[PDB]
């Protein structure tokens, strides 16, 4: 177990806390213009 | 090496303690506040409930801020050095001793 | 060894007050009878200023009696929790409570 409060009850229920660890465009997407 | 981290962290605390702290006409010496900060760094280094206590009001938050950052620095550089100790760095003279102590 | 004479105890208290607390090698170089670990153990056992060497009451006896059954071993874990924190007065109080209730 752990003794720490959740982020949903500390940042407010009206907002949405976003947390991103990894796995987002591995040096391919924002390098060049996308294939339209 | 690591010296730029040290020089940067001391000078940024110097810049902040120049700008804030006194708030009017105080600036209690200089080396003294840096010494309390250094003792706090050792206190968080102490892995303990040894902690820098009985201080000023807002200097406490500044001390805690730079303390947690230097702790993050030590943890980050040490975890990376141990990972380099796996088979990446293949080499150490004193780096072996420093990583063993920090871990 | 470790007879812990009174003239050695006063010198150890003066060395703890003058030199410091986290420097055991500096305090062992002015006694010529014990090592640094024995001096630190004496300073943490009998020469500590926060040690309550007297005033054994019924509340502490009821606290130690309601703790020796939950944990039969590990008397050092219940040393700071009971409030004695001497690591030998707890065993002596347990022996006194076991001998007085036996008759």
């Amino acid at each position: 177990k752990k003794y720490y409060p959740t982020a949903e009850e500390v940042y407010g229920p009206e907002v949405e806390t976003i947390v991103q660890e990894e796995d987002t465009q591995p040096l391919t997407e924002p390098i060049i213009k996308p294939v339209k | 090496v690591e010296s730029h981290f040290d020089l940067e962290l001391r000078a940024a605390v110097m810049h902040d303690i120049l700008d804030m702290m006194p708030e009017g006409i105080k600036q209690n010496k200089a080396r003294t506040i840096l010494q309390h900060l250094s003792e706090a760094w050792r206190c968080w280094k102490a892995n303990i409930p040894w902690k820098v206590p009985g201080l000023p009001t807002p200097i406490e938050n500044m001390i805690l801020r730079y303390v947690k950052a230097k702790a993050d620095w030590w943890t980050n550089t040490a975890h990376y050095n141990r990972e380099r100790i796996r088979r990446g760095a293949t080499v150490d003279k004193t780096v072996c001793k420093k990583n063993l102590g920090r871990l | 060894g470790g007879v812990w004479r009174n003239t050695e105890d006063e010198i150890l208290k003066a060395a703890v007050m003058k030199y410091g607390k986290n420097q055991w090698s500096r305090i062992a170089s002015l006694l010529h009878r014990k090592s640094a670990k024995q001096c630190k153990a004496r300073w943490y056992e009998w020469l500590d200023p926060s040690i309550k060497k007297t005033e054994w009451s019924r509340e502490e006896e009821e606290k130690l009696l309601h703790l020796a059954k939950l944990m039969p071993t590990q008397w050092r874990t219940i040393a700071p929790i009971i409030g004695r924190t001497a690591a030998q007065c707890l065993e002596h109080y347990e022996f006194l409570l076991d001998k007085a209730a036996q008759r």
Partner: protein, 320 residues
Amino acid sequence: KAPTMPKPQWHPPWKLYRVISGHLGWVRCIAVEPGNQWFVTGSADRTIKIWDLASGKLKLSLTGHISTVRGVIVSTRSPYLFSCGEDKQVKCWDLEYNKVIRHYHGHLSAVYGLDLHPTIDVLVTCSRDSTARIWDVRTKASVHTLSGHTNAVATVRCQAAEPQIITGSHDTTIRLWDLVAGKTRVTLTNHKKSVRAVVLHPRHYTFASGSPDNIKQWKFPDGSFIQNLSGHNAIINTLTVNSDGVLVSGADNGTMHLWDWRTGYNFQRVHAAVQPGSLDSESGIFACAFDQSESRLLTAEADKTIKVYREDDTATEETH
């Protein structure tokens, strides 16, 4: 009965709508791209990462710095981004290959910030040793060294014809030099506290500055003290203003005080909450920049979290 009390700007109050905390370390610089697609931000982990403006997810990350990155700027005339920090190196990370394309050097110490000109293809970089540096893009050569301060240069602002070169110094004095001659042109008549916040205006001239104590305003033609700010005695780090007339100053104590450009009245003056892993008093707004649409605000705190603030559709929010 007060002066200019009944002539305030009825601006709506700002409110947070999403929480994003993915970096490992206190964020120091945060910017937005000119195409309103993604937002580039750096932290103390020496790894600049980009995040989408709408979704908020992390698109891609890139490391390469040796120390903390205290500066990030995106170019509009070229398809590349620029970064600088405490590693004594100004890296121009291009977007066509996501690699170091310039790796310019020449600073004697750590670098505080970097920014590019509005029309010229040059970039002014503020260092920490004794001066700032003007580096020419695609040449990696020192054009002119502007040494007019007696301490480190905390902030630096540029323009096409607004104030050309404008560098704020931490030696309790401001100085605006000329880019052609290189020497200092005119120095300020303000800022006993160390001034570390300079920003451009989003309308006409007579822009303002930001400092820890007694923040005042300036003028583009040769400087003129127009007005002073409110009672913000906290140590301010970044000040951002939009074209709608709203001005917001971020302090290091977590309290963000919003003001107006026409009057200068405190609108919200709200305090930011801390994260779950943060301490009780550790959040400090060190970077703040508005979006390209000037509708959603984005502030970077010292509690390792990037918060996105949006507008609030209210009407009973009149200023006294």
